[PDB]
Design a binder for this molecule. Structure first.
Ligand SMILES: CC(=O)N[C@H]1[C@H](O[C@H]2[C@@H](O)[C@@H](CO)O[C@@H](O[C@H]3[C@H](O)[C@@H](O)[C@H](O)O[C@@H]3CO)[C@@H]2O)O[C@H](CO)[C@@H](O)[C@@H]1O[C@@H]1O[C@H](CO)[C@H](O)[C@H](O)[C@H]1O[C@@H]1O[C@@H](C)[C@@H](O)[C@@H](O)[C@@H]1O
Length: 161
C-alpha cells in the first residue's frame, strides 16, 4: 500500500482526523503540542536500560531538567502534560515500544496518543474545548494516516514500518 510521507520536522496545525505517525532516530523531545488554552503535550523518548539519568529537555520554550528511568529492553515514550501555562509538567502516560513509533491525532473533542506496551498498544485521549488551535512542533520525520485507516496506524505502532 501507500503511506503519506515522510515529512521533515516542522511546526504546523495538523488537520483533524489525520494521525501523525512519528519516526524518531535519537531525538530526545519528539513532539510538542499546544493550543495555549488547555492543552500542552510533549513526548520524550528514552532509550533501553537507563537508570536514574538526569537529562535536559526544552518544552515550549522552557528548558527543563528531568530525570528518567527505563529498566526495560524496549524504548519508552513519556507523555508530559499540563493544562495551563504556569503549571508544572506531569508525566501522564507511557508507551513502551520496540518499534520506536508513536502517534498524535486531533479528533472530535480530544487529542489522542498511544500508550501501553507493544505489540498491544492502544489509544487514549485528553479533551479540549479548543481543538482547532492545537499546533504541533514535530522534531522528527513523520507520516500522515487518515483516521479511516487507523487500524494501519495501530499496526505500524505495534509491529513497525
Ligand atoms: C469506541 C471507539 O470508536 N473508539 C475510538 C474513538 O472514538 C471516539 C469518537 O467516536 C468520538 C466521536 O467521533 O467520540 C469519542 O468519545 C468521546 C465521548 O463521546 C465524550 O463524551 C467524551 O467527553 O470524550 C470522548 C473522547 O473524545 C470516541 O472515543 O476515537 C479514537 C481516535 O480515533 C479511536 O482510537 C478509538 O478507536 C478504538 O480504539 C480501541 C482501543 O483504544 C479499540 O482498538 C477499538 O477497536 C477502536 O475502535 C475501532 O476503530 C475506531 C476508529 C472506529 O472505527 C470504531 O468503530 C472501531 O470499533
Amino acid at each position: 500500500g501507500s503511506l503519506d510521507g515522510p515529512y521533515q520536522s516542522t511546526s504546523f496545525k495538523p488537520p483533524s482526523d489525520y494521525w501523525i505517525l512519528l519516526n524518531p532516530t535519537n531525538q530526545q523531545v519528539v513532539l510538542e503540542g499546544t493550543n495555549k488554552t488547555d492543552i500542552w503535550v510533549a513526548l520524550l523518548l528514552v532509550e533501553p536500560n537507563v537508570t536514574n539519568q538526569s537529562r535536559q529537555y526544552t518544552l515550549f520554550g522552557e528548558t527543563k531538567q528531568i530525570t528518567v528511568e527505563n529498566n526495560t529492553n524496549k524504548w519508552k515514550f513519556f507523555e508530559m502534560f499540563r493544562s495551563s501555562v504556569s503549571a508544572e509538567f506531569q508525566h501522564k502516560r507511557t508507551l513502551t515500544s520496540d518499534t520506536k513509533l508513536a502517534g498524535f491525532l486531533k479528533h472530535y473533542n480530544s487529542v489522542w496518543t498511544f500508550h501501553g506496551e507493544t505489540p498491544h498498544a492502544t489509544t487514549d485521549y485528553s479533551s479540549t474545548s479548543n481543538l482547532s488551535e492545537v499546533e504541533t512542533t514535530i522534531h522528527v520525520e513523520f507520516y500522515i494516516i487518515p483516521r479511516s485507516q487507523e487500524s494501519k496506524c495501530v499496526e505500524y505502532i505495534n509491529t513497525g514500518l
